[PDB]
Ligand binder design. Structure first.
Ligand code: BHN
Ligand code: PER
Ligand code: FE
Length: 498
C-alpha cells in the first residue's frame, strides 16, 4: 500500500481522447499519452518518442528519427506509421485546433519508413517543437483504437505509450490509474493512483483531514487558502507552494462603453491595491502582478511601468476624461451617464466572488460602479467568446504556452483576448505582428516584435493584472517531497518517490 495513492480532482479525467478537449483533463491525457519531444524547465525540448531530428535550410521540412523500442500499453508497436496516422486524425479535425498555430502550419505528415517521420510546414514556425510537446493534441493513441480510422468522433480504449494506464472510470465518483509495467522509460515508484471526484474546495480539504485522500495538487483554487495556511503549520501534514506559474488578470473590453475609453482603463489599473486584495482574499499566498506576463517570462522582461495603487491618480484620470461626481452621488457621470461597468465571473466559485467583491469595492472608492454578474461556467465562457462583458476574470496558461501560444491565440476571434482587444485602433497591427513573431528566426526582430506587442497591450491598458499564482500541494508526509512539472498543466506523478 505505500506505493498506492489516493488523490482528488474536481471532475473525472474524461474519456482520454488524446485529440480532444473538455471533458478531457490535460494532466490525465499527459499521464497516458506521450509527445515526440518533451518540454524541459529551461524552455528546451529533449528527445522523447523521437530520438533525433533534422530540418531543411528553409526551416519548413522536419524529419524525426523515432525510437524503435516503444510499444503501446496493449502491446502494439509505436512507429512512424502510427505517429503519422495520429497526425492525420488530429488534422482531420483541423478547425477545432485553430487556437494552436501549429495545427494551421502543418502541411503534410508522412511516414518515410518505420523510424522516419517527415513533417512539412507552411512557414519556418519557431515554436514547432514546443507545440509538439504540449499535452494535446499532438500525442499518440494506438491506431487500432481509432473509430472508423478517426479520433474526432471518439476512440475505443485510451491506449497510449505513457507511464500510466487508465484502469477504470466511474462517472462522478473516481478514476483509477495503474503504472504501465511495460513502459519504455523509467518505472514509476507509485503503482496505483485513485482520483476521487470532489468538486468543492472545502470538501477536498475535509477529505484530506479525514484521511480519505493522501494528496491534493492544484492551483490557487485547490482548497480554501485560509485552510491551506493552517495546514502548513500542522505538523501532521506536508504542504508546498511553488514559485508562480501564470497570471490571473481582468480583461477589459476596449469595444464596449465605458471601458472603450483609454482613460477609464488606465484609471481602473490604478484603483486596486493588489497586495491588499491578495492578503484579504487569497490569504497572502500569491504574488502581486503589474504586467500581463511576469518579468521572468521569456521575452517579457521589458521594463514596463507598473501602475502602482494610487486612487488619487485614478480619480484625476477620470476627472480629466469628463467623468465627474454629481451632487451628492458617489458614482461619476459623463453627460448624465453613470460610470458603470459589469464584471462577470463564475457565480459558484467562492474565491472568484470574493475577488470580484474587492474589485467592486476598490473601484467604488474612485467613483466607478462595478456591477457583479455571477453566472454558471458555460455562460461565462459564452461571454468570453462573444465579447459580452465589460470586465471578465481571465488567466494566462503557464509554461510552455506563455507568452507565444497565449499571444498566438489573441488572433482567434472566439477567445476573450481578441474580444477585449477588438476596439483598439492598433488591433490589426498587433495581430499582424503576432503572426510575424511566430515565424521569425532573426532573434533581434523576434525580441522587437514581442516588445512591441506587449508594450502596446500594456500601454493600452487592455488588462488589469492581479496576481502571479502558484501551484500548491497538501500531502501525507510519507509521500515525501512532491515535484512540479515543467508544463504548468501537468502533474508529475511518475516523479513521486516516497
Ligand atoms: O485546451 C488546451 O489544450 C489548452 N487551452 C488552449 C485553448 N483552449 C482550447 C480548448 O480548450 O478548446 C480554449 C481556451 C481559451 C481561453 C482560455 C482557456 C482555454 O482553455 C489553453 C489552456 C492552457 C493551459 C491551461 C488551461 C487551458 O485552457
Ligand atoms: O483547456 O482547459
Ligand atoms: Fe483550453
Amino acid at each position: 500500500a505505500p506505493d498506492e495513492i489516493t488523490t482528488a480532482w474536481p471532475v473525472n479525467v474524461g474519456p482520454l481522447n488524446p485529440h480532444l478537449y473538455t471533458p478531457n483533463q490535460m494532466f490525465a491525457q499527459s499521464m497516458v499519452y506521450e509527445p515526440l519531444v518533451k518540454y524541459q524547465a529551461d524552455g528546451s525540448v529533449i528527445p522523447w518518442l523521437a530520438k533525433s531530428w533534422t530540418h531543411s535550410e528553409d526551416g519548413k521540412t522536419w524529419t524525426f528519427t523515432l525510437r524503435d523500442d516503444v510499444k503501446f500499453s496493449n502491446g502494439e508497436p509505436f512507429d512512424a506509421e502510427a505517429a503519422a496516422e495520429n497526425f492525420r486524425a488530429v488534422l482531420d479535425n483541423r478547425q477545432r485546433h485553430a487556437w494552436l498555430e501549429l495545427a494551421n502550419q502543418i502541411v503534410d505528415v508522412k511516414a518515410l519508413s518505420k523510424t522516419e517521420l517527415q513533417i512539412t510546414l507552411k512557414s519556418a514556425y519557431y515554436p514547432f517543437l514546443q507545440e509538439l510537446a504540449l499535452p494535446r493534441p499532438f500525442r499518440f493513441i494506438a491506431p487500432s483504437q481509432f473509430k472508423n480510422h478517426e479520433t474526432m468522433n471518439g476512440i475505443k480504449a485510451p491506449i497510449g505509450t505513457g507511464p500510466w494506464i487508465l484502469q477504470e472510470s466511474k462517472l462522478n465518483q473516481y478514476d483509477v490509474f495503474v503504472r504501465n509495467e511495460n513502459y519504455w522509460g523509467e518505472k514509476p515508484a507509485i503503482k496505483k493512483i485513485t482520483f476521487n471526484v470532489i468538486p468543492d474546495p472545502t470538501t477536498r480539504a475535509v477529505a484530506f483531514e479525514t484521511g480519505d485522500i493522501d494528496l491534493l495538487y492544484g492551483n490557487e483554487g485547490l482548497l480554501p487558502l485560509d485552510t491551506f495556511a493552517r495546514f502548513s503549520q500542522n505538523p501532521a501534514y506536508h504542504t508546498q507552494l511553488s514559485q508562480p506559474i501564470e497570471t490571473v488578470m481582468l480583461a477589459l473590453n476596449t469595444a464596449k462603453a465605458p471601458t472603450n475609453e483609454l482613460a477609464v482603463r488606465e484609471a481602473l489599473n490604478y484603483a486596486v491595491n493588489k497586495k491588499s486584495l491578495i492578503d484579504n482574499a487569497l490569504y497572502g499566498t500569491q504574488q502581486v502582478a503589474d504586467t500581463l506576463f511576469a518579468p521572468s517570462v521569456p521575452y517579457a522582461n521589458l521594463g514596463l511601468k507598473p501602475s502602482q495603487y494610487d486612487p488619487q491618480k485614478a480619480k484625476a484620470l477620470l476627472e480629466k476624461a469628463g467623468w465627474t461626481l454629481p451632487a451628492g452621488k458617489d458614482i461619476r457621470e459623463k453627460n448624465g451617464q453613470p460610470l458603470r461597468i459589469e464584471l462577470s465571473f463564475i457565480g459558484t466559485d467562492a474565491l472568484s466572488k470574493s475577488m470580484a467583491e474587492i474589485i467592486q469595492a476598490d473601484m467604488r472608492q474612485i467613483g466607478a460602479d462595478v456591477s457583479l454578474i455571477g453566472e454558471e461556467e458555460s455562460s461565462i465562457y459564452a461571454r468570453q467568446r462573444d465579447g459580452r462583458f465589460g470586465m471578465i476574470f481571465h488567466r494566462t496558461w503557464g509554461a510552455p504556452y506563455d507568452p507565444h501560444a497565449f499571444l498566438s491565440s489573441m488572433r482567434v476571434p472566439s477567445h476573450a483576448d481578441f474580444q477585449a482587444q477588438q476596439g483598439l485602433a492598433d488591433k490589426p497591427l498587433i495581430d499582424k505582428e503576432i503572426g510575424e513573431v511566430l515565424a521569425t528566426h532573426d532573434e533581434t526582430q523576434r525580441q522587437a516584435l514581442y516588445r512591441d506587442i506587449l508594450t502596446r497591450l500594456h500601454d493600452e491598458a487592455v488588462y488589469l493584472p492581479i496576481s502571479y499564482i502558484s501551484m500548491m500541494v497538501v500531502s501525507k508526509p510519507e509521500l515525501g517531497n512532491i515535484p512540479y512539472a515543467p508544463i504548468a498543466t501537468e502533474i508529475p506523478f511518475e516523479q513521486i518517490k516516497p
